[PDB]
Write an enzyme that holds these catalytic residues in place. Structure first.
Site: not given
Ligand code: MN
Ligand code: MN
Ligand code: NA
Ligand code: NA
Ligand code: NA
Ligand code: MN
Length: 324
Positions: A51, A54, A61, A95, A169, A172, A178-179, A181
């Site tokens: 792939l 990779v 690993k 942070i 998201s 989609r 997550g939040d 937008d």
């Molecule tokens: Mn966002």
């Molecule tokens: Mn978002």
């Molecule tokens: Na952060």
């Molecule tokens: Na590869």
């Molecule tokens: Na996010």
DNA sequence: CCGACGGCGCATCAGC
DNA sequence: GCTGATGCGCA
DNA sequence: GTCGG
């Protein structure tokens, strides 16, 4: 291949947060993404090695993780106090790798140390600390829909010609986010337009008025980053506080904008590279061609997301097919 | 081997 | 006090 | 770290 992608993602985070090696971070995420899209259970490193993204080190690993069920490199890192603490602290909004490292050098390494040292935090960081647990919760699609209705309607109240679109998201179609937008347009603001004042401020201010937006992380004329929260009942559980981003974009560029801010992040990275792989260059605002040397010409006309897909010869993929 | 891998809006603050 | 330098988050 | 010069 969740075991493998989890491992690559944790390695990515280390390279970004501790090693400050942003290209390795991206390399690991690129590998995790192509593996998550692989429709077979990976039996060996050499199998993954086929792939793209990779390589030699990641195949090895993968051999180790497949054999032992763990990775020694990750074990040592998790055991390492400085590494572990820096990693942890970056989970606070505001942070980053540099602040996290400086805090840890000063013996600040826990949420409690951050509490004890609030005077050393800037306003964004205090907010991230305040909402530490909240910001790591996902937002159920049901609440995303309630959030959508509030934003759309309060936007109406300021002015009816605004168009606000929830992307990311949510667009989609994911079951949690997550939040939030939000892309914002208005007829008065286009790629020329004399610069219309307070267009975004008006909307941010209204959303504050109705107490939907509770905190501001950063605010300017095109971009708002802050915190919001659904109204509760009578005696009920407060909803968690949520992250919300609002971007105001020139109307004539709405489709490049919707395309980009729908994502995914990896998808848009994937689109731009394939764009150049066809003589085009895409950003958040426009799709342009380069010529034979390779400076980009003028913005080609666009009235739909698929218009963009046509140009670079991809089969159109509905918002739900862009989670990479 | 080697170098590219995307760039920008906004907030902060060290060094004048 | 100002601003160049840098950090942060981000589809 | 990876892959196309
Ligand atoms: Mn966002
Ligand atoms: Mn978002
Ligand atoms: Na952060
Ligand atoms: Na590869
Ligand atoms: Na996010
Ligand atoms: Mn197959």
């Amino acid at each position: 291949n969740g075991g493998i992608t989890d491992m690559l993602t944790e390695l990515a985070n280390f390279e970004k947060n501790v090693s400050q090696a942003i290209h390795k971070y991206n390399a690991y995420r690129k590998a995790a993404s192509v593996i998550a899209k692989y429709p077979h259970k990976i039996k060996s490193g050499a199998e993954a090695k086929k792939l793209p993204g990779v390589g030699t080190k990641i195949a090895e690993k993968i051999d180790e993780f497949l054999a032992t069920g763990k990775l020694r490199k990750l074990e040592k890192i998790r055991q390492d106090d400085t590494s572990s603490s820096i990693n942890f602290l970056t989970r606070v909004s505001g942070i980053g790798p540099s602040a996290a490292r400086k805090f840890v050098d000063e013996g600040i390494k826990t949420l409690e140390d951050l509490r004890k040292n609030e005077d050393k935090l800037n306003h964004h960081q205090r907010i991230g600390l305040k909402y530490f647990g909240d910001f790591e919760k996902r937002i159920p699609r049901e609440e995303m829909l309630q959030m959508q209705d509030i934003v759309l309607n309060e936007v109406k109240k300021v002015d009816s010609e605004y168009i606000a679109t929830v992307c990311g998201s949510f667009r989609r179609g994911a079951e949690s986010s997550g939040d939030m937008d939000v892309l914002l347009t208005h007829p008065s603001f286009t790629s020329e337009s004399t610069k219309q004042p307070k267009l975004l401020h008006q909307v941010v201010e209204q959303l504050q008025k109705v107490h939907f937006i509770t905190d501001t992380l950063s605010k300017g004329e095109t971009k708002f980053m802050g915190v919001c929260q659904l109204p509760s009942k009578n005696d009920e559980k407060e909803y968690p506080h949520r992250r919300i981003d609002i971007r105001l974009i020139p109307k004539d560029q709405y489709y490049c904008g919707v395309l980009y801010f729908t994502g995914s992040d990896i998808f848009n990275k994937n689109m731009r590279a394939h764009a150049l792989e066809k003589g085009f260059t895409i950003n958040e605002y426009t799709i342009r061609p380069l010529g034979v040397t390779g400076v980009a010409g003028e913005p080609l006309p666009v009235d739909s997301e698929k218009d963009i897909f046509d140009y670079i010869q991809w089969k159109y993929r509905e918002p739900k097919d862009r989670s990479e």
